[PDB]
């Protein structure tokens, strides 16, 4: 084929040209940029919540959950990386160490620590199985990392939806390509045994008619679960009732890849879609689309509210960009020239990656620090300049 190959050549040329310009502009756009090459690409990233300060040094040690997807032959791993970060305070020699390498069955599609017990990590893995690990544990006989404490059997195809209930310890939700949502009750209670425990769902939802891409519990209401899907619906589930029926919203006309509930509000929810937009919703009046955030140039896949600032939201796309939105600029006037760059609330575009964004994660221990991964093995840890977000 003659158009495909030369179009891919031209795309790579564009990427290399724009990466060179991005590097030239970094000193004006960032307060920090740390880049680390990984041995394997990761589909997932999450900051763990611990921070270790060292008296007499100007940096702290923090940690990231990572995974692998050799997806053929090589053994996969749930990994924990330890990274130095500078200690900010108000007005490039930093290392990484892969400190834990835990054998994992198949690609690590998604991994999340339990908020109430961060040493417990759930993953979505081979064939649809979910797995539970205790990262403080060891092999029965050796110092090698432990086998899964539990395997969660229920999904019949692989999935990427995974989230813990921040208000009900050990409560887990998963969504997968079998179009099903499984609810689980994980009792770390039970990991006093010489063998991996097998766990079955406490509940299953067959309410979507296509791949379930993302699930999230409302940060402050333990019975409330949001789900989004390739069937182009956002669904709000009450986990007390019986599969009664959820609230269904035709939120976009193309696939919905991610969902994110504001951690500071009761009501504000955002969705990210293959239609290249992020949409905002008020849970008290969920059938009215409040606003549509424009700026990405391809499908939007990642979405996470800032854990420190109520109006700050971030998204990521196969356009290779991570965008940061500031909802306080809703309504501000802009010229049609500026509008070509995006909606008024678009605050910052991170252009440091040179392939599709896999996932990113806000650093809970520092303000305005993001860790992001792309498919070409690159991890970047970065902070936009206080010139841009300050005041």
């Amino acid at each position: 084929e003659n158009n495909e190959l030369n179009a891919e050549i031209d795309l790579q040329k564009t990427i290399q040209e724009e990466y060179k310009l991005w590097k030239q502009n970094v000193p004006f756009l960032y307060d920090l940029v740390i880049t680390h090459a990984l041995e394997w690409p990761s589909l997932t990233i999450q900051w763990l919540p611990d921070k270790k300060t060292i008296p007499g040094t100007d940096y702290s040690i923090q940690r990231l959950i990572l995974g692998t997807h050799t997806s053929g032959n090589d053994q996969n791993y749930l990994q924990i990386a330890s990274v130095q970060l500078p200690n900010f305070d108000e007005d490039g020699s930093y290392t990484i160490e892969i400190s834990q390498k835990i054998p994992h069955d198949g690609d690590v599609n998604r991994a999340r620590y339990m908020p109430q017990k961060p040493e417990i990590i759930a993953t979505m893995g081979e064939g649809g199985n979910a797995y539970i690990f205790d990262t403080t544990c060891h092999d029965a006989l050796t110092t090698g990392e432990a086998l899964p404490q539990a395997v969660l059997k229920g999904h019949t195809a692989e999935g990427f939806g995974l989230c813990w209930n921040p208000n009900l310890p050990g409560n887990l939700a998963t969504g997968a390509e079998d179009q099903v949502i499984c609810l689980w009750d994980v009792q770390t209670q039970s990991f006093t045994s010489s063998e991996t425990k097998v766990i079955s769902p406490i509940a299953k939802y067959h309410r979507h008619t296509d791949i379930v891409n993302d699930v999230q519990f409302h940060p402050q209401h333990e019975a409330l679960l949001a789900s989004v899907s390739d069937d182009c619906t956002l669904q709000i589930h009450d986990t007390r009732l019986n599969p009664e029926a959820p609230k269904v919203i035709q939120a976009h006309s193309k696939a919905i890849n991610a969902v994110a509930i504001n951690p500071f509000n009761d009501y504000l929810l955002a969705t990210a879609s293959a239609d290249k937009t992020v949409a905002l919703w008020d849970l008290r009046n969920p059938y009215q689309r409040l606003h549509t955030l424009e700026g990405h140039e391809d499908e939007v896949y990642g979405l996470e509210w800032s854990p420190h600032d109520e109006p700050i939201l971030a998204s990521s796309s196969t356009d290779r960009r991570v965008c940061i939105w500031d909802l306080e600029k809703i309504g501000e006037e802009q010229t049609p020239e500026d509008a070509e760059d995006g909606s008024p609330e678009l605050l910052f575009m991170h252009g440091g990656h040179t392939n599709r964004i896999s996932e990113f994660s806000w650093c809970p221990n520092e303000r305005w620090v993001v860790g992001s991964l792309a498919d070409d093995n690159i991890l970047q840890i970065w902070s936009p300049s206080r010139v841009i977000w300050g005041r």
Partner: peptide
């Protein structure tokens, strides 16, 4: 180039 130039640069990603 003060704050407003930097803010268009930021929205464009410096690219």
């Amino acid at each position: 180039i003060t704050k407003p130039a930097i803010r268009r640069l930021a929205r464009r990603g410096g690219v």
